[PDB]
Symmetry: C3
Subunit: 335 residues, 3 copies
């Protein structure tokens, strides 16, 4: 809620419970999942052709005690600033969305779950540190609906292989016309020595790509993503306590939703990602499910939701991917 | 300070020092105790019979360095959202006050100390994770001053016995009339296997109950709480480095205060909690003291206070409960 | 941005990258250095002679992942409240700037680097916990431009020698007249037993002092600081993994800047600190460099900057102080 400069502090409180049998063997786990969010975003008009802007956003976990676990799962999601010039484009630097999320964003619309391939700190698919992003709308004002973006990922040598990266570039192009949108996005980067010493994944570069199609009009939302990755998607073998990256993955995400005037937004979805050439096992499913779910919007400040994952991962999955379903029920106050 | 929706960011900065001899052997300890608070609370009118709301609140410690200890004692206090409907009642889910605090709230009014039995993450007496709370004012609008509440506590299997719980229900009823208020509150819950493996406490359920009486009118505040607990109150034997829960406790809390027009709010108080059937020792006092103290309110944004604990715990207490007095002097800017 | 009481929430997002060769052997290091800041400051008019106030401020790192490193470098910078009375003076308690920073503040003006001797949690030179500060402007209203301050530092017995202190007093006096300012500041304090068990530094008290001269007018800023310290400045011998405090240091800081109407603020600077009588090595340089740099201010909400450290520390420095240069390029949205 808005606190020549327009600055806006924002957030929400999310009362959130997950239901699974036992949740060690499930898609989402079991129990209290309450958290809150806080951030600001602002933009300042510098002149008629130039705006300056910034955004910061934080996750506060609501399901930890006030003892020594208090900080578990607290983190900054976003922290960047930039400049937007005339028809030239925008440029920002900091922690932000990786460019391949320009595609994955199409399916990442579910009430609680979904977007399973947009890992955080995973090269270009999710939120990530140290990125320089250039974005361009309507091709310099010459072509209504043709947007593009390029992004430069600086190396992050962290203590974990999962959270690290090397230098890389990625980019994306999209075209929209009367409710239809089409997008493609691709990136590659160096892997770090720590990533390469892992027993899962083989190679010295990582690539992610995805294409998107979507129809967004007349209270209907339909969307589709297909993508693949090389040496990029993080993976654990829970049976030998083995970690790393899948050599290859192949990914599909489908979503159908409708918006009723009275607030009810039903959701239907399917998601599958399968890893290939995983050392010592071959091909495995990482994600496999159908979704049903709904959100009820009381207004712009208040909603509740149920999200139900009909898990299709079989009880024998070779890496130890859980097989039970998960339901989520949430209540949200936002501003 | 207020930032169809009414949302309010709030907080305070508390300059705070504690004085004790040595503070290893004291009630409150010795030294810098500065901290700050930040939160939001908002409510949105959905229609004439329905409001939606949320609250989040965080504790930032001000007495840690900017080195590796920086986060010590930082935590979310509250994070919940809910719906309030007509005369039906309110319902919220998230981290919130346990229902037995509906009684303990009567005495928890001192400038710095007091409220010694309202432990955090301790079933129903204090702030706790994963609770669903229903509250009812004036009995559905049929009975002015008769309020009640029921609360459902979801199991929290944490890494510590102190911070965990099992599933449980608790509730409370109160009646108020012309400055007088009367309250009763009770809850029980399952204890977790971790709690049961402790060497202090014996049993597979936990119960807390308390009654409250108070007079709140004509610039006078008088209040009284009596309560008991089974297998609920956390306790340490500092002499053998032994921890767990007291089998039984018996608790009394008394408070007298007056408000002068010029801002001066003197406080007088007494508090005693005694554990029974503590393994290998029998009966012990956990808390035993008189208080004198005062707050000076400059206005609604600024106050100072002194709070002085006249400790009655004797120097031989069998669990190693400290015996020296503690003074606290604070200065508070809030908004 | 301002959210009888005037309260102001504020912050910035800083997109920030450091360039060094390799940065293990450099002044500033290499890579992503993005972070954000959030705080409030408020003041309340209690009557015509009395204002009450508070300030809190936090550092959120933007260059950590959302995994287990998420909190690295997050901390409260400031958290205090106080009262300002008529001509008498102001008094505040909490975490705040140490009084010797009243001098070091003169040179601490560079776009990214500079202020190298104003260590955090280091007695009086930097931000520190548990201080009571009295400040006086115009000598009780009797002497325009003559300010003074005294400060009382409470002992902080922490787990690290670097972050601890004993009880101490420090103070400062300054005089300003038509763009010229002159300042002196001094403090001493007890060292704690932990500090004394270190292999670097010898003695049972710590003192810091500094003098400042500055010209601040006509879009010119020139300033100069000289100071010394005994048993106060923290130091590591990276060759034997040895830590502690330099017995003596001698410090010089120089800065020249100009402000163009169009926003461009060029900076020129020199900084040297040298430790003496360091056990097992004698005299060593801790800091030695020239700076060139600039900030471009688009407006009051947006700026970019480059800051370039021309390191003069030689490749043989005896404690292992790095010798390569560092450049920093930043983009800042603030409110
Ligand atoms: Br917490
Ligand atoms: Br995500
Ligand atoms: Br993830
Ligand atoms: Br990051
Ligand atoms: Br654009
Ligand atoms: Br649907
Ligand atoms: Br801290
Ligand atoms: Br409490
Ligand atoms: Br507690
Ligand atoms: Br909790
Ligand atoms: Br009610
Ligand atoms: Br009284
Ligand atoms: Br983080
Ligand atoms: Br500093
Ligand atoms: Br430092
Ligand atoms: Br501190
Ligand atoms: Br003054
Ligand atoms: Br210059
Ligand atoms: Mg934090």
């Amino acid at each position: 809620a808005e606190i020549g400069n327009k600055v806006d502090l924002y957030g929400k409180a999310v009362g959130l419970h997950y239901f699974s049998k036992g949740g060690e063997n499930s898609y989402g786990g079991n129990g209290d999942m309450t958290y809150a969010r806080l951030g600001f975003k602002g933009e300042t008009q510098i002149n008629s052709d130039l705006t300056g802007y910034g955004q910061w956003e934080y996750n506060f976990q609501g399901n930890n005690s006030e003892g020594a676990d208090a900080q578990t799962g607290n983190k900054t999601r976003l922290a960047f600033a930039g400049l937007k010039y005339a028809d030239v484009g925008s440029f920002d630097y900091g922690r932000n969305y990786g460019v391949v999320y320009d595609a994955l964003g199409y399916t990442d619309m579910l009430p609680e779950f979904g977007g399973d391939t947009a890992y955080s700190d995973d090269f270009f698919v999710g939120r990530v540190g140290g990125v320089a992003t250039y974005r361009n709308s309507n091709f310099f004002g010459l072509v209504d609906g043709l947007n593009f973006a390029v992004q430069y990922l600086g190396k992050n040598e962290r203590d974990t292989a999962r959270r690290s990266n090397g230098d890389g570039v990625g980019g994306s192009i999209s075209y929209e016309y009367e409710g239809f949108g089409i997008v493609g996005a691709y990136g590659a980067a160096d892997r770090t020595n720590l990533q390469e010493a892992q027993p899962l994944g083989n190679g010295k570069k990582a690539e992610q790509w995805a294409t998107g199609l979507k129809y967004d009009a007349n209270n209907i939302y339909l969307a589709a993503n297909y993508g693949e990755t090389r040496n990029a998607t993080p993976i654990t073998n829970k049976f030998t306590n083995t970690s790393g990256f899948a050599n290859k993955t192949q990914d599909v995400l489908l979503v159908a939703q409708y918006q009723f005037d009275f607030g009810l937004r039903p959701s239907i979805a399917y998601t599958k990602s399968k890893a290939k050439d995983v050392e010592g096992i071959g091909d495995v499913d990482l994600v496999n499910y159908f979704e049903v779910g709904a959100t009820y919007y009381f207004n712009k400040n208040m909603s509740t939701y149920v999200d139900y994952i009909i898990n299709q991962i079989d009880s024998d999955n070779k890496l130890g991917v859980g097989s039970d379903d998960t339901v989520a029920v949430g209540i949200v106050y936002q501003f």
